[PDB]
Structure 1
């Protein structure tokens, strides 16, 4: 239903990560990050949707979703940074890179992208201590070189 309303985060992310896209749809990607900051429940819904798309068996779907995540985090909004900086969301990324879960069934391209993003946040947003906690654990388990 919400996917039938072009302005909803659901409809936006379905376009921004559509497996049929021949190339990155920056219009939909930036539109998603923008719509994200319109409502108080926007950020929480965004991470919920992103987490699912990122765990998709269809690589191109997961890759575009990671591009959306990377792009929105690059925006200077505190609310979204804080939502991604919660284990509620970080655990979903851990499941993708961890061999104990989806790691053994996820491409190297996707897993590497997640690790690169996590690292960039540990450097650029040091105040999101939970992100650093998650990253350090991954390096302790041998996930991160």
Structure 2
């Protein structure tokens, strides 16, 4: 009586980023990355869902969401990489760290993790020209750790 119809990306991400989680839910996290490739609508939906979660005022929700993003960048391939490397997504991270937007009430832990991940991708995936541009802009505008 196990359900054949695929679990939704919404159901999956809500479990992977649930503020009640006592520790990282790796099964749900790995499951979400594994499933977002399953259709055309998948990877853009996944990035929209992640962007919302990352903007949470509840620190543990946002930190879990960033851990999903980190993990999916490792396990997933091109369609997901292409969605993350658009300003459609990158702008949502910018809004989290910028004082113009949400930055003044975002947790330092969340802001620092965003800067780490962006920096990591500049070195690990140098082809992604818009990730490089966004990161260069954040430095130019004086967005730094702590």
Given that residues 36 and 46 in structure 1 are in contact (C-alpha distance below 8 angstroms), is that contact kept between their aligned partners in structure 2? Answer: yes
Q: Tell me the matched-pair count.
A: 145
Distance 1:61 1:5, change over 3 A: farther
Given that residues 16 and 25 in structure 1 are in contact (C-alpha distance below 8 angstroms), is that contact kept between their aligned partners in structure 2? Answer: yes
Compute the displacement of 1:74 (Å): 1.0
Distance 1:2 1:90, change over 3 A: farther
Distance 1:38 1:98, change over 3 A: same
Q: Distance in 2 between matches of 1:74 and 1:44?
A: 17
Worse-superposed segment, 72-81 or 3-12:
3-12
Q: Which runs of 4+ in 1 moved over 2 A?
A: 1-6
Compute the displacement of 1:75 (Å): 1.7
TM-score normalised to structure 2 length: 0.94
Given that residues 2 and 8 in structure 1 are in contact (C-alpha distance below 8 angstroms), is that contact kept between their aligned partners in structure 2? Answer: no
Query: CA RMSD of the aligned region, Å?
Result: 2.9
Given that residues 33 and 76 in structure 2 are in contact (C-alpha distance below 8 angstroms), is that contact kept between their aligned partners in structure 1? Answer: no
Structure 1: which 5+ residue stretches go unaligned?
Answer: none
Structure 2: which 5+ residue stretches go unaligned?
Answer: none
Worse-superposed segment, 57-66 or 71-80:
71-80
